[PDB]
Structure formats: C-alpha cells, structure tokens
Design a protein around this ligand. Structure first.
Ligand SMILES: Cc1cc2nc3c(=O)[nH]c(=O)nc-3n(C[C@H](O)[C@H](O)[C@H](O)COP(=O)(O)OP(=O)(O)OC[C@H]3O[C@@H](n4cnc5c(N)ncnc54)[C@H](O)[C@@H]3O)c2cc1C
Ligand SMILES: Cc1cc2nc3c(=O)[nH]c(=O)nc-3n(C[C@H](O)[C@H](O)[C@H](O)COP(=O)(O)OP(=O)(O)OC[C@H]3O[C@@H](n4cnc5c(N)ncnc54)[C@H](O)[C@@H]3O)c2cc1C
Ligand SMILES: Cc1cc2nc3c(=O)[nH]c(=O)nc-3n(C[C@H](O)[C@H](O)[C@H](O)COP(=O)(O)OP(=O)(O)OC[C@H]3O[C@@H](n4cnc5c(N)ncnc54)[C@H](O)[C@@H]3O)c2cc1C
Ligand SMILES: Cc1cc2nc3c(=O)[nH]c(=O)nc-3n(C[C@H](O)[C@H](O)[C@H](O)COP(=O)(O)OP(=O)(O)OC[C@H]3O[C@@H](n4cnc5c(N)ncnc54)[C@H](O)[C@@H]3O)c2cc1C
Ligand SMILES: CC(C)(COP(=O)(O)OP(=O)(O)OC[C@H]1O[C@@H](n2cnc3c(N)ncnc32)[C@H](O)[C@@H]1OP(=O)(O)O)[C@@H](O)C(=O)NCCC(=O)NCCSS
Ligand SMILES: CC(C)(COP(=O)(O)OP(=O)(O)OC[C@H]1O[C@@H](n2cnc3c(N)ncnc32)[C@H](O)[C@@H]1OP(=O)(O)O)[C@@H](O)C(=O)NCCC(=O)NCCSS
Ligand SMILES: CC(C)(COP(=O)(O)OP(=O)(O)OC[C@H]1O[C@@H](n2cnc3c(N)ncnc32)[C@H](O)[C@@H]1OP(=O)(O)O)[C@@H](O)C(=O)NCCC(=O)NCCSS
Ligand SMILES: CC(C)(COP(=O)(O)OP(=O)(O)OC[C@H]1O[C@@H](n2cnc3c(N)ncnc32)[C@H](O)[C@@H]1OP(=O)(O)O)[C@@H](O)C(=O)NCCC(=O)NCCSS
Ligand code: NA
Ligand code: NA
Ligand code: NA
Ligand code: NA
Ligand code: NA
Ligand code: NA
Lengths: 380, 380, 380, 380
C-alpha cells in the first residue's frame, strides 16, 4: 500500500486547481446566479487537456491514468461542480463508451475530438418511463437501408442541447427486452434530432440539462456502437465509471463547503471570540473533515481498480453512495456554520448545499447504489 | 391528557386549510419562482382574521387560544411557508410584545391594526455584530426632548420594508450591557428610518427579509415599549413564542413534503409497480411520517404551555430544534423519492427542501436551541 | 388538547415511582448481575395493584385507564425494566386477550387472578420457524373429545416457565393458513406442558425468557379462546397493545439512562470543571432529552387512542419504533458520558444500554413496525 | 497510489487469520462467557511472533512494517477482539515507547522479551482524577539514592496484573504541571507494586483490565524512560499509535459482525425466502459494508503515515473516531439482523456489540478524537 499520489497525479491535481482558480472562481457566483453554461469556458477546459487525461495519446489524450482524471473532477468541483459534471459527462459518459466499444474509425472520429477538447459529449439513456428501470427503453431504432431511423426522446441529459456528440440508447428488438437495446453515436445537427426542454433545477445551475427528441431521426448505420443488442451492457459499464465521476464531484463539493466554513469560522466572532472557539462547532467541523477523508479513499480506490483492469462496479457504487451522502450532510452543516449569512447567495454555502442534493440522484440514485452493493455483498 | 383538538382549534385549522387551498396553492409555484411577496395576498390573510386569532376581541382579535394560531401557521406552511412565516412574524414577533408590554394606548394604536389585518409587523433585533450574541447591540437610542433619536441598523428582518410597524431594540445605556437595552415601536415612514438590502436567499422566496437603517431616526418618547433597560427581556420573551411559530412552520413544511412524496410514490411506476411497492422507500416514508408525528406534539405542547401561562421557553426551544431538524431530513428524502423530477422546479419537493434549511437558523439557531435546552436540563 | 395528566394518572405514576424506589432500586444491580427473576418481588408488584390498573373492578382491577397503566410500566422501567416487561407481558400480552376475547367464565377464572396480582401471565406465539412470519405456525391443536391435544413448542417467551397462565397459538386447520390458527389458555402444570431452555441473553437479565414444549398436551376444550380460526386476529390485536408497553419500557430505560448521565455529568470533574460544562456533552444531553420528549407523546397518544376505543395499531407501531430507537441511541451516549466508568457494571449505564437493544426486537422488530406504519401511510 | 497489500502484509494477514481460526475461534464463546484471559493462549500468540512484527530483528522482532502489525490486530479482532486489544496494548502501548525512547540496554532488557513473545506489557497513565485530563497526574515519583520511590495508583489498565512489564507515568515535579511528568519501566513483582480491582465490564470479557497500586514502590533509577519531565510527550506519542490499534480493533469487530450477519441472512428464512431477500435488510447490510470500507482506509492510512515517519496524530484520531463509531453502528444493526436470536449469547452478535462500545471510549474517548481533529483542522 501506498497512499501517496504519483508525480503525474499530483501534477494533474495542481493543473486543475490552477485552472479552477484562474477561470472558474472569479465567475462562478455570477454564472450560478444567472444560470449560465458558458461554452467558451468549457472550451478553455478542453483546451487545457482535462478531457483527455485518461485516454491514449493515439486518440488525442495525455496517456495518463483514471485517478488523475478523477482528481481533476474533484478539484474543479471544489470551486464549480457545474463545470465538474460537464467534464465528467464528457469523459466518463460519452468518450469512455466510444473508447471501450467503438471501432477504430469511430474512435478517431468521435473520441479524439473530445479528448482534444473540441467537442462536448453527452449520454442519452433516461426516458420519461425509464429512469431507475433503465432497461424499459421505448425509443426505437429501425434499420432502413444505410440508416437507422430513431424515434423517441430522452430527458435530463447532462450537456444536452450544447453537446456535439451523443451516445444514445434505443430498442432495436423490443421482444428481446434488455437484450434488445443498442447504442448509437449521434451528432448535433443530424436530421430529425432536436432538443426540447432545458430543465430549471434546484441547483447545478452551471450545468446544462436538456431533453433530446428524435423524430424519424436518421442515424448512419455505421454509427451503431458495439453490436446490436449490446446496448444495455454498454450503458451499465459506462455508468460504473460515471459513478466514480459523480463520487468525485460530491467529494469536491464537500471539500469546498468545509473549506469555506473553516475559513468563515475562524473570522466570524460572537461573544468576543471566533465561532471556531465553540466546542459544538469544532466537533461539527471535525465530523465533516472525517467523513470527507473517509469518502476520499473510496473514490480513489474505485478509480484505481478501474485503472488496474479489475472489477470496480461495487467499488464505484460504494464511493458514489457514500460521497454523495457525505456531501449532503457536510453542505447542510456548512450552511449552518455561516448562520443567517449562509442562507444568502452572497456567501458560498447555499450553492454547495443545493448542488449536493443532485449527487444523490443522478448516475443512478443512491437506492440503486445500495442495490448494486447489496447484490455484490450477498452473492454466492 | 387529551390529544383531541377543541372545536375552536379544528375550526381554525379548517379555515386555514381553506384559505391556503383558495389563495395560496394556485400561485405559490409562480410566486416562489419570481421571488414575490404579494402585499395584497398578505392583506387577504389579515382580512380573513389570521393575525388576530389569539388576541382579545377588545384589540380587534378573535379571542381564541395560542394553539389555534399555531395550527394556522402549520396549515399555511404545508402550502406556502413564506406566507406562514409572514404571519408568524406579524403575530409572534410584533403583535405579541406590544400585547404583552404595551400600554393600553399603544395596544389600541399598534396591536389592533395588526389583529384586524391591515398592518404588517416586524421585529428588529439582529445586527451585523449581534446575531447569536443578541445582547451585543450597537444600535443606540438617545432621548432628546420628546423624541428618542436612534442610530444603527438591523439585518435579516422578516417582513422588513413591507411592514408597517416594527418593534426594534437599541442601547439606551451601553455601560449596563444586557441591562441597557430598550424596545421601541417604530412606524414605516418615520424620518431617518429607511431600508437597505433585501436579501436574495437560498429559499423563503415568498418571504421578505430586509436590512433596517436608522440615521438620526426620530421616535416619539411615548413609543418606548416597556421600561428603559427592559429590552432584552422583551426580546427573549418574544423569541420564546416565536420559536413555536418557527417550529409550526417547520412542521408544515415537513408535512407538505411528505404528502407530496406519498402521493407521487403511489402514482410513479418503475419495474412494473408503483415505487411505493419497494421496501426501502416504504421504510423511508414510515420514518418521515413518524418523525413528523413526534415533532407535532412537541410543537402543540409548547403552544399549550404558553396558553396556560406556564413556563414554555425550554419547550419551545425543543420543539423548534426538533421540528426544524425533522423538516430538513424529511424534505431532503422527499426530493429523493421524486428522483430526477425532484431536483426540478416543476415539482414541489425542491422548494420544501430549500425552505426547510432556514428553519434551523432563524429565531435562534439550533445550536442556541441546544444551549437553552441544556441549560434547563443541567440547572442547579 | 390537554397535555396534563389526570389526577388518577398522576397518582398511578407516583405509586409506581414509590414502588420502584422501595422495592426495585435497592436490589436491581444485584439481581441483574446474578440474572435473577425474583417471584416474591413480582408478587409484591401484583399485590400493589399494577397488574390490574386498566381492568374493570368486576374482573379484579382498579377500573382506571390505559395511560395510567402505561405510566406505571414507564416508571418501573426507569429503574428495572426487567420488572417493567414482566408487568407488560402480564397485562398487555396475557390478561388483555383474555379480557378482550374471553367468555365470562374465562375472565373470572384467568383474568381476575392476574388483575388481583396472584398469577403471572405469558403469551406463546413465536416458534423456531415463525418469528416475524408469525402466521407460519407449526404447533398443532387437534380436538379429541373434551380436549384439544397440542403438539409443538414456543421459543423466547417472556415470563415463560414461571408464569401461571399462558395464551398460546396453534394451528387447528393448516389448510386455512392464517385463518387456521386458534388461541388457547394454558395452565402451568397441565399434562404434557413443560419448559425447555431458559435463554441467556445480552441483557434483560431480570426478565425470564423460556421455551414452552407441548407433547400431547391436553387442553380442555373450553380453554379455546375466541372461535376456532380467530387466533391470528387475537395475536395481532394483542401485539398492537403490547407494542405500547414496549414503547413505555423503552421510554423509561431512556429516561433512567439520561437521568443517570445528567447527575454524573454534574458531579464528575475533568480540567477543573464539571464535565457538564463542556459544550459537546451539553449538546449530546440536550439531544437525548429532546428525543425522549418526542418519544413520550407518541407513546401517550397510542395509549389514549386505545383507551378511547379508536384505531391505535399505527400509533402503537410508531411509538414502539421511535421509543426503542431513542432508547438505543440515548443509552449508547449515556455510557459515553460516564467514560471508562460507564463500561463497568459498578455504574448503571451499561445495564440500560444492554437492555435497550431488545426493545428494538421483541413484540415485533422495528422492521415490522415500519411495515405496519408504511402500510397505514400508503393505504388508499 | 496503490491499494494493494505488499507480500509481507498479505503473509501476516494470512498468518493472523490462521492463528485466529486454530486458536481463538474454537474457544472464544466459552472464554467470553467465563470472562477468561488465558495467559497460555496469549503466550501462543507471542510465540507465533505477533508481538514482534513491527520491531527490528536486533530486538527480537520480524523487522516488518506498521501496517503488517495493524492487519494482524484487525484479523484477530474479527474473531476475538479481547485478544486483539491484548496484542495492541503489548505492542503499541508498552513495547513501542520502550523502542522509541529507551536506551539500548532498556530495549534489550524490556523490549526484546515482548517482541519475542514471553512477556506481556501494559501502559499505566489513567488515574481516578486524570482520565481525559491526562496531564492531571497525582502519582508521584521521588528519587532517593539509586531508586525512584513511587506512590499513587492507576485505573483501567489493559493487561494489568497479568502483564510482566509496565510503562507508567508519575509526577517528578508537580509545580511544572504537564512538564513535570516522567515515564518509568516497572516490573511485576517490584516491592510496593500491587494490583487492585479487576474490572467487571459490559464487554471485553477476554481482555483484562486492572487497577495498579504503588505504595512506596521501589523503581531502579535506570528504569526512568526518557528524560525527567518528558513523560507527557512519551504518553501522547504512544497514544497516537495506540489509536491506530484501537481503530484496527474496531474495524475487525465490525467486519466480524457484518460477516456473521451476512451469513445468517442467507440461511435464515421467513415468508418463504431468505431474509437477505428483503430490501430494507439488503440496504442495511450495504450501508454496513460501505461504512466498513470507508473506515478501513482511514486505519491503513494512519498506519502507513506512521511507517513513513510522517505526522500521523490527526490521521490516527480520525481513524479511531470513525472506525469505533462504525463498529458501534454496525454491531447494533448486526444484532438486529439476527432478530431474537441476536439478543442471545448462543449467537455471536451480542458479543460484538458489547465489545464495540469500549472502542469509543478507550485510548481517548471519541470526544478527545474530535478535539485532536478539530485542533488540526482549525490550526493557525
Ligand atoms: C440534473 C440531472 C442530470 C441528469 N443527467 C443524466 C444524463 O446525463 N444522462 C442520463 O441518461 N440520465 C440523466 N439523468 C436522469 C437520472 O439518472 C435519473 O433521474 C435517475 O436514474 C432516477 O430516475 P427517475 O428520475 O426516473 O426516478 P425513478 O426511477 O422514478 O425513481 C424515483 C425514486 O424511486 C426509487 N426507486 C426506483 N426504483 C427502486 C427500486 N427498485 N428500489 C428502491 N427504490 C427505487 C429511486 O431511487 C427514487 O428515489 C439526470 C437527472 C438529473 C436530475
Ligand atoms: C431569513 C432570515 C430571517 C430572519 N429574520 C429575522 C427577524 O425577523 N428578526 C431578527 O431580529 N433577526 C432575524 N434573523 C437573523 C437570525 O436570527 C440570525 O441569523 C441567527 O440568530 C444567527 O445569527 P447570525 O446569522 O449572526 O450567525 P452567528 O451568530 O454568527 O452564528 C454563526 C454560527 O455559529 C454558531 N454559534 C454562535 N454562537 C455559538 C455558541 N455560543 N455556541 C455554539 N455555536 C454558536 C451559530 O449557531 C451558527 O451556526 C433572520 C435571519 C434570516 C437568515
Ligand atoms: C427477550 C425476548 C423476549 C421475547 N418475548 C416473546 C414473548 O413473550 N412472546 C412471543 O411470542 N415472542 C417473544 N419473542 C420473540 C420475538 O418477538 C421475535 O424474536 C421477533 O418477532 C423476531 O423474530 P425472529 O427472532 O424469528 O427474527 P426473524 O423474523 O428471523 O427476523 C430476523 C431479521 O429479519 C428481519 N425481517 C424479517 N422479515 C422481514 C420482512 N418481511 N421485511 C424486512 N425485514 C424482515 C427482522 O426484522 C429481523 O431484523 C421474544 C424475543 C426475545 C428476544
Ligand atoms: C476497558 C478499559 C481499558 C482501558 N485501558 C487503559 C490502559 O490500558 N491504560 C490507560 O492508561 N488507560 C486505560 N483506560 C482509561 C481510558 O482511557 C479512560 O477511561 C478515558 O480516557 C476516559 O477517561 P475517564 O474514564 O476518566 O472519563 P472522563 O475523562 O471523566 O470523561 C467522561 C466524559 O466526559 C467527556 N469529556 C471529558 N473531557 C471533555 C472535554 N474537554 N470536552 C468534551 N468532552 C469531554 C469524555 O469524552 C467522556 O464522555 C481504559 C479504560 C477502559 C474502560
Ligand atoms: C437497477 C439496475 C442496477 C439493475 O436493473 P435490472 O433491471 O435489475 O437489471 P439486471 O437484471 O441487474 O441486469 C440485466 C443485464 O445487464 C447486465 N448488467 C447489469 N449491471 C452490469 C454491469 N455493471 N456491467 C455489465 N453488465 C451489467 C446483467 O448482467 C444482465 O445481463 P445478462 O442477463 O446478459 O447477464 C440498473 O437498471 C440501473 O443501474 N439503473 C440506474 C440507471 C442509471 O444509473 N441511470 C443514470 C443515467 S446518467 S445520470
Ligand atoms: C444565546 C442566548 C440564549 C443567551 O445569551 P447570553 O448572552 O448567554 O444571555 P443570558 O446570560 O442567558 O441572559 C442575559 C439576561 O437575559 C435574560 N434571559 C435570557 N433568556 C430569557 C428568557 N427566555 N426570558 C426572560 N429573560 C431571559 C437572563 O435571565 C439574563 O437576565 P438577568 O441578568 O437580569 O438575570 C440568547 O442571546 C439568544 O437566544 N440568542 C439567539 C437570538 C435569536 O434567537 N435571534 C433571533 C432573531 S428573530 S429571527
Ligand atoms: C408481518 C406482520 C405485520 C404481517 O404479517 P402478514 O403475513 O403480512 O399478515 P397480513 O397479511 O398483514 O395479515 C393477515 C391477516 O391478519 C389480519 N391482521 C393483521 N394485523 C392486524 C391487526 N392489527 N388487527 C387485526 N387483524 C390484523 C389481516 O387483516 C389479515 O386478516 P384477514 O385476511 O382476515 O383480513 C405480522 O406477521 C407481525 O406482526 N409479525 C411480527 C410478530 C410479532 O410482533 N411477534 C411478537 C411476539 S411477543 S415479543
Ligand atoms: C485532551 C488531550 C488531547 C489534550 O490535553 P491538554 O491538557 O489540552 O494538553 P495540550 O495542551 O494539548 O498539550 C500539553 C503538552 O502536551 C503536548 N502534546 C499533546 N499532544 C501531543 C502529541 N500527539 N505529541 C506530542 N506532544 C503532544 C503539547 O504539545 C503540550 O506540550 P508543550 O506545552 O511542551 O508544547 C490529551 O490530554 C489526551 O489525549 N487525553 C486523552 C488521554 C487518553 O487518550 N487516555 C488513554 C489511556 S490508554 S486507554
Ligand atoms: Na436511467
Ligand atoms: Na452561494
Ligand atoms: Na387523537
Ligand atoms: Na412472533
Ligand atoms: Na450497570
Ligand atoms: Na485493491
């Protein structure tokens, strides 16, 4: 065992902290208040290399490991976890399945520009009737000549509308149920592909979330990803990695919130002393700091297993569930530490608390995480 | 012991439910989104008699009991807790200290118009340096002829700016510390009394919260409330009752959130069944329901103690602490039960959760509540 | 609403506190250490009237209400909850179903001596294969002439072996499943009725818990309780009341533990001050005191509904679940407040903690309580 | 970062598991019930090499690393945590301060026999008036010729009476307070060194805990450990490592309890299915498993920091606080999963739960852990 970062991991973490400080921090308050997803900023992140950390240089990336990428999502999320989830949807939800399942032709066409920073990616699985029950897909894809024709819709898609490239799931054979689903690579601008509602959320205001609509959408036949009927496996494998990303986002949001409260507590005086001198607040901040350290190693262990080519599905679900629960509890108390000031948008705590709640829900709810963990635990 | 409501209590509960259904529920979503405090709606509430429930008929009230009033606060808060806290601040924070410490002339002039529903009230204690440490007042009042001249400011005042009548605290003799504070009745429009920042908050969007500014503000000598030096006592007694109101608010919020979640869980299907058929969700909802019932009796007991003329400070601190913690836990799980939908403003859950958080902070934070409770526990 | 005890309720509470102080407190430590269930003490309780509080004078009781009885279980349980559960099994689990379902002849024969204090009662439902799944009864009863012949066994029976009178459940018609069970009144000393294992438990050392064994046990036909096939309804109705008893036991154990820790904390000094001066311990004791008050009114509301002849099954399950969870959490922290001393049998905290855990399990586990509450919540 | 065990670590883990299976598991139930600390079994442990794992070969040890030792403590504690804490006190509390502050002659005389497995060690800091306030030492040591003469006593000493070698703390200059404390190596059999009460505890029945009494106890001058006045530093450094041992103990306890509960849940049927098929129990077990994994990495990180010669006091306090809270929550739910059976000594759950509680108190209570953590968090 070795708990030390590698030189590459540390370098990536430092690069991310520098990016966040220069490009995210000065504007996050304003962008949050105004609900802005700023594509020029997102482009600057992509140009700085973040989307290609963990992909081979032969596909436009840096050739580094999973944990370096996870560190960057965490570090960005300390400051602007809306940008953090933007990066994670790009890498874990879109690029990864193209990397894992795509032909060489698809990897060069679609993965490389995401890794290089040019293209934003999204993952279209969730439908009105298929959320947790993700296999209950009603979007259809029917092969007609040299095209699949897609009909349906997806909802709540991170980077939706603005993404260039989508990995979408549709039924090619309803009678084969979970074995009837296939994955497709779509481009923004394809015939019959349009966007619907942009969601107005509790939080995540610097992340864009949109409906996708397919009305006889024409998808070239070669943009089938993997084999017909492999789509569920692709979705589940992708989500196993994306849960590590969300875990990292939650970790960063928790760390951001605690760092803010610590600093406030040392500055704010009541009863002629800093509030950090009251033992109940000391103990609350001790518990916050402890839960965060405990979450951190779950997230890191999952990343490492993935990098080592070992099973990581259970580890990822554990990390996701624990980190997101931590973020919710930490951020709730960080608002408390600020007092009345914490309930106002002029201070940073309320943004962290609002943004924490979604970590418990997306990429699979924490109820799903517990299903995954208990299945693994209770297997013969 | 008798857990049944009196006829008067049940009638007021019903009138509140009917008012909330007709006047609050149709517009609360749009008012929250737009951050609207609608004076004409508040006026309809006053005209219906809500602000006079627990005041004698000789002061324009209905002559009923404290719990009846508490039940109305709770009922309104099931639907629109910004309106609930507006009521509670009118009644518990402004009207009540005038009723309890005012001369007959001050009650006729200032209490009756609140009880009759034409005037909105507010309570100005908190300062930038005096939050939890409420006795650290820097606002001064200096008697000059037939006026006290006030200088200072107050922050985070519920119903501030909009309110017509204010009970405000200022140092008349700083060298006497906690014994040098006095209370004054202010009117909107007094020279030198203006309003500052209107806070932009995480929630409570249908409640108004404002800074008060006093710049040689001229207050009639006869608007001293109680004796000089009695102000801190007036503040603390007022807050004891105010805590019951906040508790009732939190209780309504939790109940509104649970009821939304129950209903949704019966209607929403995944895996071929209503989500209410999954045991983990059943248990979460059982726990929500149970916590709410436990909180309810704490709130009603505090209200009954106050109505019986018994000590209720500790009871009110317990109820407030408990019910606000329950509201926070319940609303956070109610969002969870709605899944992704829950994180969107088109469903009701996110508003309850945002609104719950402030119940843990205002009218004394839950740390203060635990100081008050522990001091009573540990006394002698 | 009225939260005041009646004069009778207060009198009963005072009688119970006096009994506990005189007869339980001086010996509970010794009886716990030695695992003694002292029948002479149990007889003194019965002679003092506790078993007959809530039964009509025409059946040997005092003619008072359910809550008076529940207060006595609570008060006894502050001091010796082993004796508390002994009383509760006597009254709620044995006497009550004879009262509710018995013929006049059975009430005079079997209820009256329990109400009068002469006879100890027990309730025999649980089998090795039927715990939570209580309908899965394998003990059989077959009518042969003027006797039912019983074969099987029960496990974990409170007051087993030492009880005089048992209400036992057996299948009279396995093919009718839950509608095939019947209830029988047994006497200690009946042919073919013997006792097996006396359990060695984590706690509850002043309560006796035994196996019952039936080997062609001959039960007079008139000792059928209710009608053939009504046995499950009798069991469930009985347990609805017994859960209020357990709730009361848990409440008392919580109160006992907190009272002990409060007193210790005011006496024990470290760092030149009483440990009650450290804000983290103040807040822990505030939370304990708050949770106990919240539990109390759930328990009392359930008792009151039962007394008023209203549905009380959901209320009882709520009270049981919440009070027992409270007792577990409170007692765990009360041991913490004592420090090292708390881990030793010379101080009282460790007995309260060990005895709290069973409250979450018997009379139906808290998982069952949540099933009952969520069914009630989610019903159409 | 590397989450894999080294070959040495895995070998020690395996040797510990094999030792526990062959020597502890067959008798732990009977030893716990009888409150047996079996010196000959402790001697077998020493002979196997467990007490020397992390000491140099020149002092009779194996020459391996801190985590290897920690892994052995954890593994033993899965089965018999009384034996685990016996080991930890031998190693972390007695052997280590001799290793870290002893002269070469004191290490050969006193360290090597522990590392070789023939001598048992103990650490005598706590006094009746000096628990959490450890610097408030009343035991005195007065140099008289070639002896220090010791007067006082110690309470709650793990391995006391049985131990052969003791590191004990006494005031050599009371007017220097925390700087007037010195450390001494004592042997069982020194004139004036006797033993007092052997504690009767809630749990830890296979660990011995005793009072030490010094009545003009004669200690060779050369048995001063470190310089005069350095004692408190020696104590605090020793406790930092000791906290890792307790953390590892708690971790083993939780793991042993979860594994028992998992296995049982797969075997026990109610309602026609294994209880592991009910979702609420699945989620409870997922949560147990997740908390244990989160705690594990805190413990291993603390151990690695110590092995790397880095600061580890805060890491060890976090690990201890977290793992002991996890053990308490896990063991309490493991009892729950066994139902009524769980409350009986014939099943393993109740012993784990009783034993978990002391991990929250000894080697510094979890309140101390939060002081240490908060002080490091809030530093500057
Ligand atoms: C901001 C945001 C971004 C999103 N991003 C994406 C995206 O980029 N791509 C994508 O495809 N999807 C996306 N989603 C959709 C998201 O993954 C789903 O919301 C989530 O899977 C839950 O589905 P649902 O909302 O339909 O809730 P439902 O599945 O209806 O769940 C409702 C509740 O029931 C519980 N539940 C359901 N089934 C069970 C069960 N068997 N046992 C126990 N409890 C159960 C759930 O846990 C939840 O608490 C996003 C959602 C949001 C809010
Ligand atoms: C929406 C809103 C409405 C409001 N309405 C009103 C109103 O109508 N009238 C009015 O006069 N005021 C009002 N307040 C102000 C409110 O009561 C205060 O915010 C609250 O008392 C906390 O004061 P503070 O914000 O200065 O925080 P601080 O007093 O600075 O507290 C910050 C943190 O330190 C903790 N803390 C402080 N002292 C201690 C201690 N001794 N021990 C342990 N922890 C401690 C607090 O609990 C809190 O967690 C309102 C505030 C808000 C946000
Ligand atoms: C000290 C003591 C005294 C007792 N006194 C009496 C007495 O006087 N009379 C009497 O008849 N009985 C008595 N009992 C028996 C007691 O009620 C049962 O132990 C209890 O009902 C649980 O049954 P079980 O122990 O078989 O656990 P099981 O039913 O095997 O339960 C094991 C676990 O599975 C959970 N579980 C089971 N089914 C489900 C489900 N559908 N969903 C979710 N979780 C589930 C349980 O909650 C528990 O956590 C006593 C027990 C004890 C320990
Ligand atoms: C089984 C057992 C084995 C032991 N083994 C050893 C051993 O081998 N060697 C050894 O020297 N000692 C040993 N101890 C003693 C143990 O470390 C102490 O019990 C522990 O430090 C607490 O001290 P105390 O019991 O006096 O409680 P106190 O110090 O009296 O504490 C009582 C309560 O007050 C809290 N508290 C105290 N001060 C504060 C504060 N400033 N702020 C907040 N809360 C506070 C504590 O956390 C605790 O909850 C052992 C104890 C036990 C029970
Ligand atoms: C609930 C959950 C775990 C399982 O659904 P369920 O309907 O029970 O599916 P299962 O029966 O477990 O799996 C069906 C198939 O998928 C496979 N599968 C499941 N998880 C897998 C994984 N991690 N890797 C590979 N295959 C997997 C199964 O092995 C099975 O295939 P075979 O029968 O070919 O072996 C899944 O639907 C899910 O993860 N839902 C949440 C979806 C989500 O996270 N959405 C987020 C969108 S982006 S915010
Ligand atoms: C923290 C808390 C409890 C105590 O502050 P502290 O500085 O310790 O004040 P204390 O020493 O307890 O009391 C000072 C005086 O006030 C009195 N006092 C305190 N609470 C009282 C009460 N409930 N009723 C009457 N008098 C009270 C005390 O008796 C004492 O008077 P004497 O010196 O004449 O005996 C108090 O300042 C408080 O409640 N703060 C939170 C403020 C708040 O709730 N703001 C909400 C604004 S509206 S959202
Ligand atoms: C799990 C639980 C709630 C339900 O079991 P389940 O197998 O689902 O039974 P259900 O189907 O709910 O009920 C079956 C019958 O009993 C009836 N019933 C259930 N609860 C009832 C109640 N409180 N009052 C009257 N009837 C009741 C049902 O109405 C149904 O009868 P009909 O079909 O005649 O209407 C029950 O078995 C139970 O309480 N188990 C715990 C047992 C226990 O508490 N033991 C403690 C022993 S003393 S320590
Ligand atoms: C409460 C706690 C943290 C601090 O007590 P406190 O009285 O505040 O002591 P402090 O002021 O922090 O420290 C006093 C001195 O000890 C030193 N000290 C404290 N922790 C230290 C550590 N981990 N390493 C080295 N020195 C330390 C301080 O640096 C200070 O020295 P200087 O004055 O020379 O700078 C300490 O007494 C403690 O750990 N108590 C629990 C005891 C315990 O764990 N008992 C278990 C027995 S075995 S089961
Ligand atoms: Na989905
Ligand atoms: Na903010
Ligand atoms: Na009622
Ligand atoms: Na049963
Ligand atoms: Na005890
Ligand atoms: Na690994």
């Amino acid at each position: 065992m070795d708990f030390n970062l590698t030189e590459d991991q540390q370098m990536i973490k430092d690069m991310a902290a520098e990016f966040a400080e220069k490009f995210l921090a000065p504007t996050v308050e304003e962008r949050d208040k105004a609900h802005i997803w700023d594509r020029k900023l997102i482009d600057k992140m992509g140009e700085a290399g973040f989307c290609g950390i963990c992909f081979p240089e032969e596909y436009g990336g840096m050739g580094l490991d999973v944990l370096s990428y996870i560190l960057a999502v965490e570090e960005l999320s300390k400051v602007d976890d809306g940008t953090g989830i933007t990066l994670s949807a790009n890498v874990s939800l879109c690029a990864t399945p193209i990397y894992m399942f795509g032909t060489e032709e698809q990897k060069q066409k679609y993965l490389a520009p995401i890794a290089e920073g040019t293209h934003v990616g999204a993952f279209g699985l969730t439908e009105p009737s298929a959320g947790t029950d993700a296999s209950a897909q009603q979007t259809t894809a029917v092969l007609k000549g040299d095209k699949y024709i897609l009909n349906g819709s997806k909802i709540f898609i991170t980077n939706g509308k603005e993404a260039d490239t989508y990995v979408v799931f549709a039924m090619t054979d309803k009678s084969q149920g979970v074995h009837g689903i296939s994955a497709f690579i779509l481009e923004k601008g394809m015939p019959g592909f349009r966007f619907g509602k942009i969601e107005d959320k509790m939080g995540g205001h610097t992340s864009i979330t949109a409906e996708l609509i397919f009305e006889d959408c024409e998808v070239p036949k070669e943009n089938l990803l993997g084999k017909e009927g492999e789509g569920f496996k692709i979705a589940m494998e992708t989500l196993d990695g994306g849960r590590i990303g969300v875990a990292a986002q939650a970790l960063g949001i928790a760390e951001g919130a605690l760092a803010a409260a610590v600093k406030y507590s040392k500055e704010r005086e009541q009863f002629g002393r800093s509030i950090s001198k009251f033992q109940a607040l000391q103990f609350m901040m001790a518990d916050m700091a402890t839960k965060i350290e405990a979450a951190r190693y779950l997230v890191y262990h999952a990343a490492m297993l993935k990098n080592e080519g070992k099973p990581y599905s259970e580890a990822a679900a554990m990390a996701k569930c624990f980190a997101s629960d931590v973020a919710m509890e930490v951020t709730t108390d960080a608002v408390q530490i600020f007092g009345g000031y914490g309930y106002t948008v002029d201070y940073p705590a309320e943004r962290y608390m609002r943004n924490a709640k979604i970590t418990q829900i997306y990429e699979g709810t924490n109820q799903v995480m517990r299903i995954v963990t208990s299945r693994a635990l209770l297997r013969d």
